[PDB]
Ligand binder design. Structure first.
Ligand SMILES: Cc1cc2nc3c(=O)[nH]c(=O)nc-3n(C[C@H](O)[C@H](O)[C@H](O)COP(=O)(O)OP(=O)(O)OC[C@H]3O[C@@H](n4cnc5c(N)ncnc54)[C@H](O)[C@@H]3O)c2cc1C
Ligand SMILES: O=C(O)c1ccccc1O
Length: 411
């Protein structure tokens, strides 16, 4: 060991917090760490299981009461609530957790010494022997390797991209906004009963499709609350804008929603009407980056590949980043002078998949809203694409990917 590997992780937010937990174990590594609700698919599982939290997650996270627990979503048309199809993810189904609670349960299993609160980074500089963080603090830290997990607005992203000779990249408003509510299930069963509606729609997660919008629901608190997220999209401007400075969240009225879902049937309308105080969220992402790495620094999580939530996939990609990165650093063979090269390996393994996840989250946005060329609102073709489209994401083998986390070959 003599000199262990010095690794800084910037951003205390799931990807970061989990890469630190990832690295913790290694002992020959020295590591320090500088929607108000989330979803996890089948491919997150292997990652969570790994980082030693299956057990705990599996208890704290919401799930759809049995036996409906394996259903990801039932897909329906908004206008009459009729069925288009269903995506089943056996085992996981609709799995979700309050963000606060997830992060927290990571960082509270994190052997003391690693968390390093006050500091956020404005800048960094590097030699080839050193990468040095500039805290606002006015102070500094220096390491062999720095992994930026500082989210969609990442400072570090654009230091890196400018260093690597690429244009900077900022959050782009997607044109889509989300009204979100949380509703007492009993209250809605009453309403549903009152209007002769199928009460199945409240027990199993649903997505209702309409032109330029969609509404999803899923039960939480073992069935007693319903999460409702009503998505609306304007595709008039070819590149839409959010007010120079509003925050990305604000409150909104129950009629500002209903106005956008005028074409929907009474199932959807009842759901929309049950939300008394809807918040609205402006959804941002960015185009895939030309690289995630330069020198001794690498981007993970939303800082690398922020995305629309339409495939419930963003966190999971952060977790796959984290897992692979833990395995890559933290492999006793690997040392300071390997870092530039090993990071460019991370890039080769991960950039493609995550970029393609970003893009297919935009594509899902359009599919759910009757905009996919070749498909639009056609029931049979919608069915076929919905029922297969998550596979390449879900059915990925993290184990095998880990085997690629190794110094090159030269041979
Ligand atoms: C309105 C909204 C809804 C979302 N819904 C989902 C969802 O359903 N499923 C999902 O997987 N992701 C969702 N996301 C994104 C999800 O929160 C991120 O993928 C994940 O938290 C990013 O991991 P990170 O490590 O990049 O964290 P970071 O966001 O990088 O946290 C780092 C922060 O702490 C400190 C740093 O300076 C920085 O500010 C949503 C985001 C928004 C804005
Ligand atoms: O839980 C969510 O907010 C979500 C949003 C879009 C698509 C799938 C999802 O689980």
């Amino acid at each position: 060991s003599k000199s262990p590997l010095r690794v800084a992780v910037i951003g205390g937010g799931i990807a970061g917090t989990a890469l630190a937990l990832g690295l913790s174990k290694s002992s020959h590594v020295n590591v320090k760490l500088f929607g108000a609700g989330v979803s996890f698919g089948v491919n997150a599982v292997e990652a969570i299981q790994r980082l030693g939290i299956g057990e705990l997650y599996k208890s704290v996270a919401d799930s759809t009461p049995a036996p409906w627990q394996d259903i990801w979503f039932e897909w329906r048309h908004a206008h009459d609530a009729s069925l288009v199809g269903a995506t089943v993810a056996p085992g996981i189904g609709q799995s979700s957790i309050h963000r606060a609670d997830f992060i927290d349960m990571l960082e509270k299993r994190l052997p003391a010494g690693i968390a390093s609160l006050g500091k956020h980074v404005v800048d960094y500089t590097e030699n080839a022997e050193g990468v040095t963080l500039n805290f606002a603090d006015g102070s500094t830290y220096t390491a062999d390797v720095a992994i930026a997990a500082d989210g969609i607005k990442s400072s570090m992203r654009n230091t890196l991209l400018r260093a690597a000779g690429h244009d900077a990249v900022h959050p782009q408003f997607t044109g889509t906004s989300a009204y979100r509510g949380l509703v007492e299930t009993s209250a809605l069963r009453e309403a549903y009963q009152a209007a002769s509606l199928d009460e199945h729609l409240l027990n199993v997660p649903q997505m209702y499709l309409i032109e330029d919008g969609h509404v999803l629901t899923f039960p939480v608190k073992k069935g007693k609350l319903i999460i409702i997220v009503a998505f609306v999209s304007d595709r008039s401007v070819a590149k839409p804008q959010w007010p120079s400075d509003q925050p990305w969240v604000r409150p909104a009225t129950t009629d500002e929603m209903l106005h956008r879902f005028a074409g929907a049937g009474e199932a959807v309308k009842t759901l929309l009407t049950s939300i008394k105080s809807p918040t609205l969220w402006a959804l941002h992402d960015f185009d895939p980056l030309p690289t995630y790495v330069h020198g001794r620094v690498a981007l993970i999580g939303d800082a690398a590949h922020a995305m629309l939530p339409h495939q419930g996939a963003g966190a999971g990609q952060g977790l796959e980043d984290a897992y692979f990165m833990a395995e890559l650093l933290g492999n006793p063979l690997h040392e300071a002078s390997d870092i530039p090269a090993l990071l460019e390996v991370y890039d080769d393994v991960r950039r493609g998949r995550a970029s393609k996840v970003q893009l297919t989250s935009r594509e899902a946005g359009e599919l759910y809203e009757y905009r996919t060329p070749g498909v639009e609102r056609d029931t049979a073709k919608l069915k076929a694409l919905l029922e297969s489209r998550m596979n390449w994401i879900w059915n990925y083998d993290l184990g095998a990917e880990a085997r690629l986390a190794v110094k090159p070959a030269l041979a």
